[PDB]
Amino acid sequence: GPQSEPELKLESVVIVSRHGVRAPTKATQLMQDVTPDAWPTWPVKLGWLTPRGGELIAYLGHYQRQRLVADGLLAKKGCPQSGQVAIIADVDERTRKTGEAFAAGLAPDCAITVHTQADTSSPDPLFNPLKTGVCQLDNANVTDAILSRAGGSIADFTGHRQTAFRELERVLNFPQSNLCLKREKQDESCSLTQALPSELKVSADNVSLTGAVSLASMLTEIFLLQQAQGMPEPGWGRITDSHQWNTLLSLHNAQFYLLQRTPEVARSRATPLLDLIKTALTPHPPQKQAYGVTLPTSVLFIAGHATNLANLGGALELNWTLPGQPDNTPPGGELVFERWRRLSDNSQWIQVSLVFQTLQQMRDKTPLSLNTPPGEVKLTLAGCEERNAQGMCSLAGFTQIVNEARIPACSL
C-alpha cells in the first residue's frame, strides 16, 4: 500500500557506544569504610564485561539491524557485504567484547571483525590522546574553566548538592559506617562531604576530583550497574523509587559535567574521535584507513567509554538528558551520527541522536525491536548555522564545527 513519501535517504551511520555492563573496576578500603554493609560480589573479574552486559549490547545490535533495514541501508536477510559494516574497539576486554556483542546482534554468525590497534596491551590514543602524551592540557585554562562550571569552587559545588549526598548517605547507612563510628568525635553529625573534602587536581594528562565527589560518582554508578545486572537488591534494598535513582545518579552526572564535558578538556580528549567520525561521514571514494578499515562505508560501530561520549558532547555542544535512564552516559549508550541525503536537491545532512536502554529495559533484560525500541533523544549541534526542517546540520556546517572544535595538537 502507499507509504510515507521518502524525504531523506539514509546513507551512512557512525555509532559511538559505551561498553556494556562491566564489573566494578576496584574494591577499595574507602568503599569498605563508608558502609557497614557488604558490597555484593560480581560474576567476573574486576572491570570485565558481564555475560548479561553482552546480551544487553546484542539487543541494541539486533534493534539497529531492524531499523537500518527499515531505512534501506542494510539487507533484510544475509550477511552484510564485506566492509559494509565495520567495528572498531578500544583495547580493553570490555570494549572488544562489546564490539563482538553488537556484531552478534546486528549480524549473527557473520563473523564481522572487531578491529583494534595492533598492541592490545597498550593504551590506544584514539580513545584518549592525553594518556599516551600526544598532547597536554593547559593547566591554568582547565583549572579556571572547571572551577567556574562548578559554581566557583568545589565547596560551592557540593553545597548545592547536599540533598543528593544525604540521599547517598541514607543508601550507604553511612552513619553506622566505620568512617563515621571512628570519627573525632562523637558529638558532631557525620557528613560525607566533610569527612572526605574534595579538591580539583589538574595535570598535563588528566583531571580528577578527590574525596566525596569522586567517591559518590563511583558508588552511584555501582548501584546503577547492580540494577542493570539484575542483582536482587541494589543498594542493600534501600533504593526503592525512581526519584531516588535520579537523585543518586545526579552526583555521577555532575562529575562528568565538570571533568569530561568542560570544553577545555573535552575538545583535546575528543580530537582523534572527531577526525575518525568526520572521516567516516564524508562522501569519498572508499579507502583503507585507520585500523585497516575501509572508509567511508555503511555502518561504523566504535566501542569506547562514557568519557568518550561526554567528551564528544562537550566538544560538539550536544546536550542531553535521558528519560528513564538516570545515567547521562549509560552502559551501551550510543551517540549516533547519520549522514542523510535530501531527495529534493540531493544535499547532504548530519543528524545526531543518543540511543540508550532505559534502566527498566536493562533491569528487565527487555529484548529490543521496532515495536519495543530503546530510548532515543534527538540532539542539536548548538553551533550549527545551517539546519534543515528536521534539525540536521548541513554537511558543510558540520565540517566547520568539527574543524573549529578539534585541537590540531591532539590529532593522530
Point out which residues bind Ni ion (CB under 5 A): 151, 156
Nearer to Ni ion, 158 or 227 (CB): 158
CB 314 within 8 A of CB 146: no
HSE-up (13 A, CA, CB side) for residue 189: 4
- Least spacing, CB of residue 161 vs Ni ion, in Å: 10
Q: What is the C-alpha to C-alpha distance for residues 272 and 129, in angstroms, rounded to an integer?
A: 7
Nearer to Ni ion, 97 or 261 (CB): 261
Nearer to Ni ion, 7 or 156 (CB): 156
Per-residue cell: 221: 554508578
Q: What is the C-alpha to C-alpha distance for residues 365 and 124, in angstroms, rounded to an integer?
A: 32
Sign of the torsion angle spanned by Cα atoms 108, 113, 115, 121: positive
- Least spacing, CB of residue 147 vs Ni ion, in Å: 11
Nearer to Ni ion, 153 or 240 (CB): 153
- Least spacing, CB of residue 151 vs Ni ion, in Å: 3
Nearer to Ni ion, 154 or 352 (CB): 154
Dihedral angle of Cα 225, 354, 101, 251, to the nearest 10 degrees: -20
- Least spacing, CB of residue 143 vs Ni ion, in Å: 18
Nearest residue relative to Ni ion (C-beta): 151
- Least spacing, CB of residue 212 vs Ni ion, in Å: 17
- Least spacing, CB of residue 19 vs Ni ion, in Å: 34
Backbone phi, psi, residue 147, to 5°? -60, -40
- Least spacing, CB of residue 216 vs Ni ion, in Å: 18
Nearer to Ni ion, 83 or 151 (CB): 151
CB 222 within 8 A of CB 24: yes
- Least spacing, CB of residue 403 vs Ni ion, in Å: 35
Nearer to Ni ion, 151 or 324 (CB): 151
Nearer to Ni ion, 82 or 153 (CB): 153
Which residues does residue 215 pair with via DSSP β-bridges, in sequence order?
none
